[PDB]
Amino acid sequence: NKTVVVTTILESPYVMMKKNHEMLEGNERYEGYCVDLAAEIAKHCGFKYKLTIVGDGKYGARDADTKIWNGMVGELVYGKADIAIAPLTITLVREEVIDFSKPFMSLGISIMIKKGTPIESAEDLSKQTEIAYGTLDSGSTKEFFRRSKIAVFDKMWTYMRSAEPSVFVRTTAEGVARVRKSKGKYAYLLESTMNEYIEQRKPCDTMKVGGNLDSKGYGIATPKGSSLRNAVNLAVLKLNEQGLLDKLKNKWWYDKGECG
Amino acid sequence: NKTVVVTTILESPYVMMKKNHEMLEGNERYEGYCVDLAAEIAKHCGFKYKLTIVGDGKYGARDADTKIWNGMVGELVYGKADIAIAPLTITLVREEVIDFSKPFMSLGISIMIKKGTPIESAEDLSKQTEIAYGTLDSGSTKEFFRRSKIAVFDKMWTYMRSAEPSVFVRTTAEGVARVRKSKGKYAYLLESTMNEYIEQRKPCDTMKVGGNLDSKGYGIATPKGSSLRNAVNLAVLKLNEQGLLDKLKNKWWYDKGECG
Ligand SMILES: Cc1cc(C(F)(F)F)nn1CC(=O)Nc1sc2c(c1C(N)=O)CCCC2
Ligand SMILES: N[C@@H](CCC(=O)O)C(=O)O
Ligand SMILES: N[C@@H](CCC(=O)O)C(=O)O
Ligand SMILES: [Zn+2]
Ligand SMILES: [Zn+2]
Ligand SMILES: [Zn+2]
């Protein structure tokens, strides 16, 4: 009936521009895990769709003062998109305003270091000051630290919120580049999925250290009242049970892996 | 207003009879992860509740011929219970007939061996005959194998469905006992959570081997149209984000683990 507007975000390897994208049009410009997922979800739910990259390049957070949502969440809330198919973390504040499918991928917050950085844990980071560390802006990881009552994470947040120069970054790519150029003096807090991906990318100079700080998942999000909610939810479960989600993770993370 | 009837299942360490249960009343008769979780869900959602143990001791399957649901799923479907708070796996066939919250615990199907069994993977099991293997006789693990189109799992199902005497077991405890008494000649396919629990129980003679075969979760289930659906879902998210779910796992799996 109507073309479904999918909001997504340029985040490797979920959605990336193809090497030859400039000569391509519409959905064909993009590739990645979420591009593949979107095609599968659309197939099983029987809709046509248009992939649109989120205008402000953000996942989604609510301004404390205006109460206005930004990012992909904002696009859903304000009716600019019909569905978000992205590595969008299922969170309480978000699930209060949009609906999430069952998770299509699990993750937890993790630590990325430049190889050789003498840091093994969140506790290690919190104890010292020589190595700076931060998170992505307008995402679920920043909110995790902001809200945490756990002493280690509370101390980390107290440090991060005030740190000069700013330890927060606008994009995951910015966080990763920062780790890579900072000679071991910057650690980055990011989701395990993204961390593991980057660990298998040239120049193979980063690694994930320590356990995950939490356990959660990404979900496909729809605005409240969406006619797509049930079908999308069931389609995620179908794709999981077919082993398709695992196949896609292997395709985008490890099959193309550059670090041996 | 009205006391919420909770269906659950006697499965360690989720729900267990307290040693002194005969001298206790109602909800106080039980202990475990899901007992603790039920109390917290009820507090956060503002309802009074009565724990009940599923009459038939099953999780929930639909009979192929009668189309009747058994187990906890049936208790929800047929209106015998208002909510299931148990290690109940989120599956497509169940989500078609009941609602699940977001997952409160992650798990995958996994392999339990008697220590020293020369099995490292599902592939290993599928390629040999000396070591028998089976699943819980009703549940999502059996269904995974029944429905699988992946070669290794198909081969396994082909073996399991035809094996005489039956490789299937009535309860997890029966599966574990069978591994323990079979001198390495039986391996049990069960959820990683249950596997990890038993690995920390005396006599410390079993272990999880290989990676998980899939990735899913347990959810709190409510019948369709339940007024509890949203509150329960948000309560799971709140409890995850506040670290309670991880605390409860540690409490019931590891804090009093018997294997060092
Ligand atoms: C990969 C997969 C598919 C399925 C499903 F299909 F069964 F739903 N579950 N999972 C595992 C998963 O994502 N776990 C999740 S997501 C999530 C939480 C947990 C958890 N703590 O276990 C806690 C609240 C925030 C959102
Ligand atoms: N997946 C996160 C963004 C990345 C992060 O915060 O680490 C979100 O949905 O906000
Ligand atoms: N958690 C499973 C039962 C255990 C199993 O099948 O391994 C279910 O909900 O069916
Ligand atoms: Zn498909
Ligand atoms: Zn503002
Ligand atoms: Zn509480």
From Swiss-Prot, chains A, B:
Modification sites for Phosphoserine: S148, S182
UniProt modification remark: Palmitoylated. Depalmitoylated upon L-glutamate stimulation.
Intrachain disulfide bonds: C204-C259
Family recorded in the similarity comment: Belongs to the glutamate-gated ion channel (TC 1.A.10.1) family. GRIA2 subfamily.
Entry note about domains: The M4 transmembrane segment mediates tetramerization and is required for cell surface expression.
Further remarks about this protein from its record: The postsynaptic actions of L-glutamate are mediated by a variety of receptors that are named according to their selective agonists. This receptor binds AMPA (quisqualate) > L-glutamate > kainate.
Protein name, per record: Glutamate receptor 2
Gene: GRIA2
Included range, full protein: 413 to 795 of 883
